[model samples]
Target chain A: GPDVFLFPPKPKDTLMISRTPEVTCVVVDVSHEDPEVKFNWYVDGVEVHNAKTKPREEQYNSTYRVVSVLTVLHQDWLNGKEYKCKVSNKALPLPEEKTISKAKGQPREPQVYTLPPSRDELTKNQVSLTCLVKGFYPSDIAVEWESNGQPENNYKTTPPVLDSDGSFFLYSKLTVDKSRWQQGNVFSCSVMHEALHNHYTQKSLSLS
Target chain B: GPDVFLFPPKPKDTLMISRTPEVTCVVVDVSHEDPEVKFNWYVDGVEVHNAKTKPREEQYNSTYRVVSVLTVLHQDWLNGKEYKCKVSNKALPLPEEKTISKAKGQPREPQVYTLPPSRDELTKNQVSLTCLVKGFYPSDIAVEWESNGQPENNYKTTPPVLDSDGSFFLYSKLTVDKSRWQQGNVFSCSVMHEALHNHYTQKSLSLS
Candidate 1:
């Protein structure tokens, strides 16, 4: 009798999976002596329906090949959900079962920042503001200002400072001209990170 | 007859005199026993008005202080303009004048950069997309992406590549799920340069 080795070990192996925000493909290889191999796929522990071997075809401009006794593909994997793969050998009196660990899916969330003095309590020429936010693993950050709900033309500078935890902290300052203070304006500060996300926190105050 | 010797022209006698942008003080070494030394001031090419000697006062900021011969306190000299000092010894028929240039003004414009396309096109199930854009000066170009007018929240690489022509080229690949492209969507490439002000040129296209 030929020995059998399960596809992925009991603990999850980091398989190289790639996808856009809409589609995902999970691949696994199994080795067994039986002429036919059974592949079981699951999402968050729920058995995947209609997940069976089929003739490989071109998908999303890439070529996929089919093999016997050693391959499985799962399409239609939901985004932001966990997925798993299992391989079994039916030749044994009771089929031998092996399970692969779960891989977490990517989630969609915009980067946000919150500042002190709240947006509504800001007064013209009198109030200063500071912003802080976290959870961004690998992105650069910035702060911009807008007046009266419109973008303002002002020179801004970012100063570098050290945080208590040895990370970096950026500071910026805005000075208002005294003549413009009497117009009851609304000032807004926006924090932008990397290429795709930004959020604004605002403050409004009157000039004396 | 007494032996007479000139003051050796006082080491090229360079005196920076200005009254407007801050009052300037000029002292004339008028200590000759024979004749009085006439003192005057000129700005650019024209002589200044109401420039003359006055009795020394301890309360004054000492606009000009020399031995007992002459002292000038021009109240209007603090107008932020550059002035020239002219001293003439009438008794000896000697004349000396020195001009000092004004302080330079701040720089005129900021720096600008043009970025290249990092990735031309990307396919589904491909986690990364590379865009390359080039041809700019000073190499301080910024690259970013916007999807359907909204910034995509993802990790992006930094500091665009600087080429030999003083231009910059940057490549950024975004990681996304393939299923997200089941229906085609548009993404915009945005390049910003500080010299071009806050304005950015955007190129938009869709992923197949």
Candidate 2:
């Protein structure tokens, strides 16, 4: 997404579907800036009126990246049925679209980057590091920090942010004193996406 | 940029600057969703105080596209040395950024689309047509409505809104009574951008 503004950054994806906890809620995502974008849900080709929207998102402009959510009970679909999320906006010629129905495919691994601290922070003997896990899909992902390949804590992370495309991005931040920010300290961002069937991804940057 | 959500979409450029009659504006465009971003301006390597911002712009999440604008005198920048719009945000490592400088480039021709009226408006013997122009840089845009080939004057147009990237989008609306809504009548939206040295762009949609 444009969120990856850095040169040679990972580009965002346009469509993705993910399951939330044993098929309770299914999310179909797409990205555009039209404020009046609308969503309609269907179960087995029948329109479902109970679909819900995420809260007031993107406080900046009228354009919003959205995930129209549909809740399905376990007993509703036999095994391998269809739930569709149809989007309508003035920009689109027609409102009907369908992708990743019966089953699913793997999401692209997240492109992670490590950001350094401010000059003022360095002068204060404090260091801050941010791990940006950007431009990945399927919504199932984790971002963590590690020191020497061992899990490291004392950091804060934000909720997964939906990109203009249906993909997702998030950043995790770790702060430490100058003594811990010095030489030999290896800091890395580990991004684990559930859509990955094989291996997770991580990238390490030395603060020195 | 994330707004280029669709693959093969127009990828947003990083910097663009343009001039109106009174003020010369600079833009350094970047994307990320956080609203607490900061900006600074420099002219001839000295910090500029006449800089302004048009809100943190992202109607969409994960792709907070913002522009830092520095207003310079029309005469002072004629023999330009250097002007910079520096952006600082959570995503960037430090207060390092470069917005738009004084220059010239052919902007992307404005993509214009006409939005249809709602079911309620159609039922009330009123047909409202809205023209939405998207993704153009170097502001100074002109939006108007036309019927057949003659220009119509009753439409209301919004101020050109700067998109997340340094580009812009806007909407212009015209409402008419049932007597004027008829078959074989064509309605069109015209957009003129300063970046386009040639004729402005417009789209004609049948009122059927």
Candidate 3:
């Protein structure tokens, strides 16, 4: 009987992938007592003989977490191929597998929100309505404004900026009269992206 | 600036707690290159100054993972107390904290299932009905079998056995004539547990 158990962060031991320099890496974390833990890599169900594994590091607990780096061509990864990491320990009844694929990084839908100008900005006798398009992938996006169902194009938009997790965000500001906003006129910020399935995602705001 | 990044097994970086001997331990895995990573422990939000931390170990990926152990009275753990682990590094913008409480070990609802006798079992001219009660907490449970809505008491049951994740499971078997099963008699395996909220969880099987 094995006293040690393998606890993955998830119920299924899913391998994680990271990009470092020119090489792509997959990480496996095991809470097992054995240092002689063995790890193997497979690409597209084929065993990758040249995959490089880092040495096992003992955790704060007695168990060990190991990393195996598999260098695939950038084109292969961008093509959304599967790379798997299989782990075996003497104490385990069966070998456990954690898999990673570039396909997991699908197009994350962006959340659209509208930010009304602060009281300080309103006191300047103008309203700067900011449409913040955030946390979107692929970076090909368009932001537009509609005032009471009429297209208003006098706005300044920033280039999509990258976030640490590889998502993109940008904001478009449409300046208008404070009186028009005070009159409870509706201002709508609409975003167009392929990720939205050819629909214009809209976030609207009004004085009311 | 450091090239290493700290990716938690989870997004929140919640600490994982494990039992070892007389001590209650919390584990922290940091994917960082620095070996001098510092860890601290807190019990019920009060910092435990004398907590012992094992030395950091380098992993196969050239990062380090460390563990810190806190010794508390067994009564405290049984009474459902909170224990927190906090980690710090020079490269990190701020310290990361992972908190674990015994309260997380709540009553987990068990899954009940009925096992049909295999072909090898059916050839014996008697059917052995197996009721599998699996992955439940607290270890206090009752399993009963019914034939056509009548209580049948002649069955063997194993004592609840503890699982690695602090749950318990057991099985009960009832032996009856194969002709009764072949005649489409409804056999029901019903389980009673506090986690089920006064409902008799049932799994039934029949030849029809």
DockQ of 1: 0.01
Which candidate do you rate higher for DockQ, 1 or 2?
2
- Candidates by DockQ, descending order: 2, 3, 1
TM-scores computed on chain B for all candidates: 0.37, 0.48, 0.49
Clashes of 3: 4
**Cα TM-score per model:** 0.22, 0.28, 0.29
lDDT (Cα, tens digit) per residue for candidate 3, span B129-155:
666565687565677888878998656
- Candidate order, TM-score descending: 3, 2, 1
Q: Residue A3: error of model 2 in Å?
A: 37
lDDT of 2 at A115: 57
Two-chain DockQ for each candidate model = 0.01, 0.02, 0.01
lDDT of 3 at B68: 59
Stretches off by above 4 angstroms in model 3 are: A1-208, B1-33, B104-131, B134-208
Please give, as one word, the docking class of candidate 1: incorrect
Q: Global lDDT of each model? A: 0.38, 0.53, 0.60
Candidate 2: where is the Cα deviation over 4 Å?
A: A1-106, A195-197, B1-208
